[PDB]
């Protein structure tokens, strides 16, 4: 009966953003070192997102939606405290942590669909107006970013403490190869459903080293996710906008490496989208191969997670360019985390009613 | 000694956004009709932007900058009132209005450089921090949009009341031709300064009518301005990023006509720009062939003026895409005007100090 106390406590600390080099410059760089770090950090991150949740209108709070998820977090917080007074050295005290993490990770595995159900409930219970959309957008973006950051920590621990890969991090990720894979997987799905699929063209632009293949330090599963989701969209649009013609244009991808950005552009000729609807494509509310996801909004969070971004620009009547912006240097790849402050509080005080433009 | 009274009065009305068809569906569709309309509308628009100005920190207000501009507006407001009690019918009462407009237009001809000087004063007098930049950005965007809308009305009147063109509006503007012209003009300047210039390639994509040339109802001088400024940028970047190589890639432009958007993409290989600096490119504060302008921020306002937009996306180490989004239908081309309300008031109450992200 002390969850509200714990939350209040760790909710005072701010989460510690880690850089990808800190992840790399790390089997047995001591997990005691990780154990003692995660015992404090996970509780701080869990509490911060839980603190935010609790200050949500009760009309959002009371839904089985938010309450169920909010209950998983309460149990995960309690789940990880058991170790606050423990002591490493005991090769058994830290093997119960690893199991404790795998159990917590799986306990939250179905959050996205669960939260999506609360969005739907809200849409039909109170309506879908710009303000409620902005508030939901603001909240889900932070909530999901927070979740991604917690899952990164956990996966880093479980994978490292079960050469080349350091957990989920590839210090020599060959971007083009990940592109190829996300593409092949997308093609397979596209072929089964439409029995026709667009081809792939890839071009690299290594600014400083003209011919060297483009490599980077990154979390490949994350990159794959983004590319795979973008490929599904481009394929759908290309195929559906050409079912009456035969010509089926290719999806072109360009990978450019600059002094600080590593950019990936995916170009299609799927008819494009009206500038006015482009804005709504990243909306959880308005957006509730295709159908499950929260493909774009969540792919974007993955890009932002390490100071990157994911932007879309279309040319109605022609095609769309989807661009993934990542940091080229591991020094600049630092976690982007949302924090609870007096600052984050007033973003929920939106009292909109008659704007500044006519 | 009654300017503060007038301002307070017309500041109660909201400006009336006009659509491009209303401009088109109009020598002598009666200027009496225009005279009586402009007598009320100009004062409403002048007063609204003047009302906004007056609520600016006194530390901005007191600068010779804002005070000089603020004095021109005071005189223009008074300049146009003289006609409030007049009576048309008198072919002389409305010819003094036309002269009164030409005189007011020229009285404000050097606002941009004047305001730019206040920005500079501010930069050195108080510093260039994110908040002051946001406030200045918010204010100058609205101030300049307002000015563009007033100048549109005035030019429509003076030109119509000195076939094919209805004032500054071309009901059959051949986009590609304007592109060609802005390009030729840019090339000439580029050749003189760098004695080398990139070529031009144009491609059209008329969705509904595959081969028909792309035409639209628009204000060509506005389109020219945007294209010309974008061409200068692309030329500079292309030339300067290839002074050590010989190959000099072309600037490619694509014009796409969709059901509601008319999009113009200008692609270059001028090395591109880091995603992080792209954001600052449209900033008046941080941004104070090249040097005078306020090229991007103001070209953008022209795009937004009729519900369009102007976006930039780069690929550091390769090139940049600048896109102009315009409404394809004259029905959707309605003035975008900034208005004074309790809503516009609280955008200046930015008390930022420690954000919501760590
Ligand atoms: N390249 C594209 N061309 C045209 N429309 C696109 C493109 N990418 C996305 N869209 C539009 O934006 C919406 C999709 O965003 P998103 O990827 O988030 O969801 P989805 O594809 O519908 O389902 P899923 O969750 O699987 O992704 C699409 O439903 C489609 O209408
Ligand atoms: N296509 C481009 N490629 C690379 N950098 C660009 C491009 N377009 C703009 N920029 C950058 O953004 C800045 C320019 O914005 P803007 O056009 O507003 O001003 P300017 O060219 O410097 O002077 P001017 O007022 O004449 O336009 C440039 O100074 C340049 O650094
Ligand atoms: C041990 C911590 C956390 N860590 C890890 O890789 C993991 C496997 O433990 C995990 F991903 F799960 F987090 C590195 C970023 C190094 N590291 C630090 O550099 C660190 C940062 C801040 C502090 C403090 N105070 C202590 C250590
Ligand atoms: C006469 C007004 C203004 N007008 C003009 O073209 C000009 C030349 O007068 C100018 F550009 F300077 F504005 C058209 C948009 C038609 N028009 C209207 O359609 C209108 C709109 C609202 C009202 C009102 N009340 C009256 C008329
Ligand atoms: Mg999708
Ligand atoms: Mg310029």
UniProtKB/Swiss-Prot annotation, chains A, B:
Q: Which UniProt keywords apply?
A: ATP-binding, Kinase, Mitochondrion, Nucleotide-binding, Phosphoprotein, Transferase, Transit peptide
**Span of domain Histidine kinase:** 120-330
Q: Where does ATP bind?
A: 229-236, 268, 287-288, 291-296
GO BP of this protein: cellular response to nutrient; cellular response to reactive oxygen species; glucose homeostasis; glucose metabolic process; insulin receptor signaling pathway; intrinsic apoptotic signaling pathway by p53 class mediator; regulation of acetyl-CoA biosynthetic process from pyruvate; regulation of calcium-mediated signaling
The effect of residue 308 to R is: In a glioblastoma multiforme sample; somatic mutation
The positions making up the signal sequence are none
What are this entry's molecular-function GO terms? Answer: ATP binding; protein homodimerization activity; protein kinase activity; pyruvate dehydrogenase (acetyl-transferring) kinase activity
One cellular component term (GO) for this entry is: nucleoplasm
User: Phosphotyrosine is carried by which residues?
Assistant: 193-194
Q: Which family does it belong to?
A: Belongs to the PDK/BCKDK protein kinase family.
How does the annotation summarize its subunit structure?
A: Homodimer, and heterodimer with PDK1. Interacts with the pyruvate dehydrogenase complex subunit DLAT, and is part of the multimeric pyruvate dehydrogenase complex that contains multiple copies of pyruvate dehydrogenase (E1), dihydrolipoamide acetyltransferase (DLAT, E2) and lipoamide dehydrogenase (DLD, E3).
Protein's recorded name: [Pyruvate dehydrogenase (acetyl-transferring)] kinase isozyme 2, mitochondrial
Gene that this polypeptide is encoded by = PDK2
